[PDB]
Ligand SMILES: *[C@@H]1O[C@H](CO)[C@@H](O[C@@H]2O[C@H](CO)[C@@H](O[C@@H]3O[C@H](CO[C@H]4O[C@H](CO)[C@@H](O)[C@H](O)[C@@H]4O)[C@@H](O)[C@H](O[C@H]4O[C@H](CO)[C@@H](O)[C@H](O)[C@@H]4O)[C@@H]3O)[C@H](O)[C@H]2NC(C)=O)[C@H](O)[C@H]1NC(C)=O
Ligand SMILES: *[C@@H]1O[C@H](CO)[C@@H](O[C@@H]2O[C@H](CO)[C@@H](O)[C@H](O)[C@H]2NC(C)=O)[C@H](O)[C@H]1NC(C)=O
Ligand SMILES: *[C@@H]1O[C@H](CO)[C@@H](O)[C@H](O)[C@H]1NC(C)=O
Ligand SMILES: *[C@@H]1O[C@H](CO)[C@@H](O)[C@H](O)[C@H]1NC(C)=O
């Protein structure tokens with residue numbers, strides 16, 4: 001389970017089925033994937049040795065996106081999908097582009113980052129709403145079996161990942177736009193000395209600082225929410241979710257900057 005609130009009994013498989021194969025992809029940083037811009041600094045036409053929260057080059061990304069239709073499997077809400085956060089994670093996220101009457105809609109998996117996922121603890125939630133990225137850190141009563149839905153194409157079940165009837169206590173609540181036409185988003189989520197840090201990119205690969213948030217507590221877990229949809233399948237549109245995640249750690253990189261100060265290359 002994620003949280004411990006019984007939000008629903010509708011269409012749950014508690015059967016000990018085959019675990020879905022988590023797909024894996026090698027981390028290659030040679031074009032600046034997994035890197036970020038340093039503070040308020042510009043570096044031009046140069047190489048820098050810098051120690052930062054970076055992926056291990058040659059480690060694996062895991063695709064933790066889960067697309068459902070009606071049934072939720074209880075095995076989705078366990079290890080290996082429920083994952084240790086440690087220092088942090090780098091996300092490579094497919095922007096799943098869907099069309100309704102030729103109008104573009106942007107979907108991708110919500111991620112939750114927390115400890116115990118109960119309403120005496122803060123859970124960070126990063127959720128897309130079609131070009132708006134809603135980021136919150138609140139005392140959510142997370143569901144046992146949380147998921148999101150396609151708002152665009154609809155779903156056979158309602159969205160429920162928390163059950164707060166009155167507004168929960170929040171440390172953070174901000175919206176960030178992202179470019180809905182992009183094919184990929186990139187995120188760093190990490191923690192240092194009781195403070196959470198987020199970086200993102202929607203164009204190119206090297207991320208930029210979004211925000212930081214003092215928590216005063218260690219985050220221990222993250223989970224990529226299942227998304228349920230009538231579409232995003234071989235019998236509808238041949239679209240897919242992808243939410244690739246790999247651990248961060250304090251690593252020395254060589255960073256190469258071009259004459260615009262873009263990180264064009266990196267070495268672990
Ligand atoms: C912070 O987050 C916590 C979870 O970590 C929330 O606490 C849970 O809140 C729910 C909702 O109030 C509690 O569930 C309800 O418990 C009642 C009491 O349970 C006893 O009695 C029943 C028989 O009635 C026994 O079966 C059971 O074993 C216990 O002995 C139940 O009466 C409720 O059931 C009724 O309402 C539901 C509504 O969906 C109906 O489906 C049922 O048919 C029935 O009519 C219900 O089960 C839960 O027990 C709490 N857990 C804990 C650990 O406390 C907090 O509410 C939340 N707080 C805030 C401010 O967000
Ligand atoms: C951040 O973006 C979300 C999603 O657009 C906003 O939430 C919606 O706000 C309207 C107006 O209050 C409600 O009618 C909707 O029900 C809300 N939810 C959704 C999923 O659309 C939110 O208001 C924005 N602003 C802030 C500060 O969070
Ligand atoms: C969850 O709540 C529903 C509604 O009361 C109930 O039918 C179901 O048995 C509950 N499941 C568990 C595991 O408690
Ligand atoms: C960038 O650096 C190279 C190597 O020193 C140099 O040859 C080139 O002229 C520089 N270009 C600019 C635009 O500074």
Ligand SMILES: *[C@@H]1O[C@H](CO)[C@@H](O)[C@H](O)[C@H]1NC(C)=O
Nearest residue numbers: 008010011155156157158159
């Ligand atoms: C979805 O929510 C509506 C409104 O509360 C309700 O009528 C409907 O039965 C719900 N469906 C499911 C599958 O939860």
Ligand SMILES: *[C@@H]1O[C@H](CO)[C@@H](O)[C@H](O)[C@H]1NC(C)=O
Nearest residue numbers: 179180181182183202203204
């Ligand atoms: C959005 O992304 C597309 C595809 O990468 C790009 O062509 C376009 O210029 C971007 N638009 C904005 C406003 O950045």
Ligand SMILES: *[C@@H]1O[C@H](CO)[C@@H](O)[C@H](O)[C@H]1NC(C)=O
Nearest residue numbers: 232233234235236237238239
């Ligand atoms: C999805 O792709 C396969 C292979 O090209 C094709 O057989 C199938 O008809 C496609 N489905 C849709 C809904 O386009």
